[PDB]
Amino acid sequence: VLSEGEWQLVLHVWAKVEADVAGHGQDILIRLFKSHPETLEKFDRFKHLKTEAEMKASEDLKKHGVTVLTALGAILKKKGHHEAELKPLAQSHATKHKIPIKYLEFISEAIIHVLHSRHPGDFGADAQGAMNKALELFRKDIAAKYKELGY
């Protein structure tokens, strides 16, 4: 369970993200796809993209990054009380999009990396640790839903 102090560190840096949702979403998905190409293959929308420049030029990718970060922000602001938000997300990702938990670990690493690059003054080690804990909680709770469903 995150402490109040940990949630403050998480939401302080997240408020900085929300100033440029789309640019963060691009950086994060591109890092994900470059660092873990298996993840790109899960996206019929995006698997035609073969270079970083093509990824950065795709408006559809930018739109999707906004969708992803908007959902994540809504979850983070619940400070753990996110059951209702995770239900549909876990269901779609387990049963329709077929995303392993490990790939959620990979996107978490990309989120952390981009936050560090964009917001170093609000993302020192204490804040990095807190954000890691928040994304771990996210994964833990999705994984329990995956297990219920047999994924």
Residue ranges at the known binding site: 64, 93
Residue from 27, 31, 39, 131 that binds ligand HEM (CB under 6 A)?
39
Among 35, 37, 45, 102, binds ligand HEM (CB under 6 A): 45
What's the min distance (Å) between Cβ of 93 and ligand HEM? 6
What is the secondary structure of 31-69 as a DSSP string? Answer: HHHHH-HHHHTT-TTTTT--SHHHHHH-HHHHHHHHHHH
DSSP-derived secondary structure letter, 121: G
Q: Is position 26 an interface residue for ligand HEM (rule: CB under 6 A)?
A: no
Contact string 59-98 vs ligand HEM (x = CB under 6 A): --------xx--xx---------------xx--xx---x-
131: which 2 tokens? 């954000």
Closest to 78 measured CA to CA, from 129, 11, 12: 11
Q: Whats the size of the chain, residue-wise?
A: 151
**Cβ closest to ligand HEM, residue 109 vs residue 122:** 109
